Structures are given as structure tokens and as C-alpha cells.
Write a protein that binds this ligand. Structure first.
Ligand SMILES: [Zn+2]
Length: 67
């Protein structure tokens, strides 16, 4: 199909998926918000899907900026 790097049937063009869920998300933000389930990534660690997942190898726990 002319001009379509994405798929028009799949949410998010089928380009944003959680492989562990086989679900297609409309946007990467929606997809990444989906991994905010700690138990999921826990299962991922057990299954060996992705060792060191989000909130661990990508954490919002820092920011050491003083004047
Ligand atoms: Zn998932």
C-alpha cells in the first residue's frame, strides 16, 4: 500500500507492541505505561524475556540537582 510504514488495522500501526502481551498500543507512551505493572516485568525476569527492565535499568529515581 502506498505510503504506509504502519498498519491501518493494528493500533499504533502495529508498531508499538508489548511482545509479552501480543497487544498493540496506539502509542509508545501507552505501551511504556503498560509496563508499570511490577508483577509483569517480574514475570518477564522469570521467563528471561528482558533481564533488567523498566524502573530498574531505566529509573525515575535520581535527580541530584542543587543550585
Ligand atoms: Zn505486557
Amino acid at each position: 500500500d502506498p505510503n504506509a510504514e504502519f498498519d491501518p488495522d493494528l493500533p499504533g500501526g502495529g508498531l508499538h507492541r508489548c511482545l509479552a502481551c501480543a497487544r498493540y498500543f496506539i502509542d509508545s507512551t501507552n505501551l511504556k505505561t503498560h509496563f508499570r505493572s511490577k508483577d509483569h516485568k517480574k514475570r518477564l525476569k522469570q521467563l528471561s524475556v528482558e533481564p533488567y527492565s523498566q524502573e530498574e535499568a531505566e529509573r525515575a529515581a535520581g535527580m541530584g540537582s542543587y543550585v
